Design a protein around this ligand. Structure first.
Ligand SMILES: NC(=O)c1ccc[n+]([C@@H]2O[C@H](COP(=O)([O-])OP(=O)(O)OC[C@H]3O[C@@H](n4cnc5c(N)ncnc54)[C@H](O)[C@@H]3O)[C@@H](O)[C@H]2O)c1
Ligand SMILES: NC(=O)c1ccc[n+]([C@@H]2O[C@H](COP(=O)([O-])OP(=O)(O)OC[C@H]3O[C@@H](n4cnc5c(N)ncnc54)[C@H](O)[C@@H]3O)[C@@H](O)[C@H]2O)c1
Ligand SMILES: [Cl-]
Ligand SMILES: [Cl-]
Lengths: 361, 361
């Protein structure tokens, strides 16, 4: 089989860390196995533009392996040229960089598999971290130190404890629930969730969560909102000017899910106006994020409220070994012709939606 | 009575935030209350140098109110000139900026009171935040974004999950235990503590903590060490070159307790050499931290591993009102002649140690 593998380049950083499997230099650590299995592997980070290495090899690729942190956008146009494509794998979690609805609506026999659960803890930790960083005003505090300054009041004037705050998640799946679990001992005033899929009642009671039926009522009462749903037609552009106007004034918003769930300029405008006190996360649309993407320079009125990072929470070294192993397992399920995929890894099976988490079908 | 109140100045920031009780402008909310009682209140941030406002008023001050974030150093030289001093109050937690041993060992009839518990949650949150920021390599990740760069591998090469790490606290009192409670749902490999005061078995079991009686055995097995003990003769310089040499190579160290529990240059050398991967916290010796303090510029080999802030974790807006009210209550106990202090607030009672947490007596 011909396999095209699109990952980020590590460049000079590859020499620093042998456990960085998720880059083009190291090929998920599965290259020896793929070679022994008799497959052809094209590895590249070159994923944009008509004569990219990606586009050169799409026409006869049997399998494309992608990774969300450097996502090959498998558009309708690319799908139409992909005459041999049978399987797209996501080394990570989240398959929205592939035009899933086009595959599904046309009935093309392409399966889309991701390594469910591989980095959900990693993302949940990043959520907790970003909530604390924003609420406690950490970014300007650190900036003050490295700029050789000292003025406690300049930080304290917009620093709070997370204790006593009302916290809402949009999406209460693997990440959203793990976020709620980690928040319990911080003594929030209340933990809330909005999801068309209810939590199991035992899980709900374990974290003291209350389900809120509609998203406007959810955000209106939340000091802190976190986005933990996949990107699909029902969440694309969900966080927009109108919905932001219904947030509690001065709320903190965290998004480690997908950038395009938010309207980028509407989040920036809400931060600059004080509708939000802070915004942070690791995910952007598109990725790599352009140098002038508005989320880089946006700040609140105090010059703070920005806890953005590149997309890496799901590619910590601990997560990388897990999604590398899961990618191998998915590939083996395909190669053997058993197609004995783990049920939870299946986004599309030969064009059909198996997941329930990407909207109702 | 004459009361000298030493707080940080908020300056222009006072106009931004009415809840900033802990600055010289707002005087803990007690200025008019003291005035209506006939007391004279001198308020200042000028606390260094022989003709500081503090030193001008020390000779006839009946009461000195301090705060850890901008600490008046009530040294033995100042005590010797403080001929009317009867009470030192700490608007906050931690009394080490007063020479407690000098008071006790030379029979000075001075009580020292602090607002125990008023910001222990705030500090515990800051510990959790700093652990996450360091382990997950957040600081350089955010720096990359605001420098208009994008390179996932430059961050991921030294990014981990906190899950699966072994975490040790030196000091398992109000903050240390609250840190352990917050870490439980993060699924650490193990939680450990070292403290001459044992936790009750039920308290140990609640957090799955294991007591280690030897400090070298404790640090040798810890991926993450957190300092949560007061500064006293038994902890001053505890974290020195020899102990750091027994830390697990590449450990992360968090200190929201007091700067001088660490030998400053020993910490910096361990970070620059890789014995530590990261250091962070909000506390310094002395405070305000000099512009040249080595904890400002120290970095690991990758230019990161520094999560320092100014001393503010215990002066969030949620904390300030708690320790302001508690300061008023301590003052009232003194003014009425009842001396009905909360027992947990008493560090020294007319020179005698009441606390057990500042070493054995
Ligand atoms: N930043 C990272 O590195 C990283 C890592 C992993 C996952 N993610 C992203 O997070 C997303 C969630 O991951 P997960 O493991 O929790 O997935 P999951 O499938 O377990 O949970 C997703 C939840 O979102 C719910 N949902 C779908 N549409 C919704 C809507 N309109 N409103 C409210 N809830 C809705 C679903 O019903 C489900 O319960 C992924 O799809 C991925 O995009 C990012
Ligand atoms: N960064 C901040 O804003 C902030 C806020 C509050 C407190 N603090 C500092 O944290 C310290 C602890 O606060 P707390 O509320 O947990 O106090 P606490 O009295 O409840 O607990 C302190 C613990 O440290 C133990 N201890 C004393 N010496 C020790 C030693 N050599 N080795 C190990 N353990 C030792 C004590 O036995 C006790 O259990 C305060 O004294 C203060 O210096 C900082
Ligand atoms: Cl939906
Ligand atoms: Cl001791």
């Amino acid at each position: 089989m011909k396999i095209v593998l699109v990952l980020y380049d590590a460049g000079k950083h590859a020499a620093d860390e042998e456990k960085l499997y998720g880059c083009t230099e190291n090929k998920l650590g599965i290259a020896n196995w793929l070679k022994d299995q008799g497959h052809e592997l094209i590895t590249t980070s070159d994923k944009e533009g008509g004569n990219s290495v990606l586009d050169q090899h799409i026409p006869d690729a049997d399998i494309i392996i992608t990774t969300p942190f450097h996502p090959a956008y498998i558009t309708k146009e690319r799908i139409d040229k992909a005459k041999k494509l049978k399987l797209v794998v996501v080394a990570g979690v989240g398959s929205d960089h592939i035009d899933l609805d086009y595959i599904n609506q046309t009935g093309k026999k392409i399966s889309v598999l991701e390594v469910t659960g591989s980095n959900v803890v990693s993302a949940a930790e990043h959520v907790l971290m970003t909530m604390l960083v924003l609420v406690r005003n950490f970014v300007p505090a650190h900036e003050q130190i490295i700029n050789h300054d000292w003025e406690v009041a300049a930080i304290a004037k917009d620093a709070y404890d997370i204790e006593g705050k009302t916290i809402a998640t949009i999406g209460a799946g693997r990440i959203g629930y793990r976020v709620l679990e980690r928040l319990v001992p911080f003594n929030p005033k209340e933990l809330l969730y909005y999801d068309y899929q209810a939590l199991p009642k035992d899980a709900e009671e374990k974290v003291g969560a209350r389900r809120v039926e509609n998203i406007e009522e959810l955000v209106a009462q939340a000091d802190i909102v976190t986005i933990n749903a996949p990107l699909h037609a029902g969440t694309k552009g969900l966080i927009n000017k109108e919905l932001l106007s219904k947030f509690k004034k001065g709320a903190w918003l965290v998004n480690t899910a997908r950038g395009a769930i938010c309207v980028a300029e509407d989040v920036a405008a809400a931060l600059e106006s004080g509708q939000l006190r802070g915004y942070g996360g690791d995910v952007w649309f598109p990725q790599p994020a352009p140098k002038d993407h508005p989320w880089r320079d946006m700040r609140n009125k105090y010059g703070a409220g920005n806890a953005m990072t590149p997309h890496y929470s799901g590619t910590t070294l601990d997560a990388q070994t897990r999604y590398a192993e899961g990618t191998k397992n998915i590939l083996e399920s395909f190669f053997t012709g058993k197609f004995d995929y783990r049920p939870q890894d299946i986004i599309l099976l030969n064009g059909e939606y198996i997941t329930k988490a990407y909207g109702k079908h």
